[PDB]
């Protein structure tokens, strides 16, 4: 479940533009700081997902001999362990359900930010943030679909998921953003 920097910034800006400037259901006394706070929420949520991965790999690393004796493939055990740790860490694995958590964290920020005022029922504000996030995710998904088509020709030369593979994915992703005018 990727949330690249450009997607996060598009969501934060769209929240400020649509709900703050256009509709006016949010009053932001410091839009620049509010945007930084939203970006920090996504960064923290990303760090949690990375921590979930390292804890899952730690379990399997410690149970190498057991997995062999059990005849359970690493990939099977990884998905199962991740499902369990995700519940214990209250991290939704589905990116859409995970975004609902992040959206609620944005609502938590909005509600506690002394530099923000709201003029509409919070659950209605959440529904509107969900619509903004879902619209941006539709764009992210059509971009990722092209990135997967373009990185296929390099799939066998790099270990999928490795740091070198992540760099190439990001490089192809940035190139798609330029071709599409999305910075």
Numbering used by the authors: 1 to 183
Original authors' sentences:
The two crystal structures differ by a 25° rigid body rotation of the C-terminal arm. The electron density resembled a 6-membered aromatic ring with a small, planar functional group attached. The density could be modeled satisfactorily as nicotinamide, although its true identity is unknown. The unknown ligand site is a pocket located in the junction between the 4-helix bundle and the C-terminal arm, near the intersection of αA, αF, and αG. The ring of the ligand is buried inside the protein and the functional group protrudes out into the solvent. The modeled ligand forms no hydrogen bonds with the protein, as judged by a cutoff distance of 3.2 Å, and appears to be stabilized mainly by nonpolar interactions. With the C-terminal domain rotated as in the C2221 structure, the arms of the Y are closer together and the pocket opens. Cluster 1/4 is unique to the C2221 structure; apparently, the 25° rigid body rotation of the C-terminal arm opens this site.
Structure-based query of the Protein Data Bank revealed no other protein with a similar tertiary structure, leading us to propose that AaDUF507 represents a new protein fold.
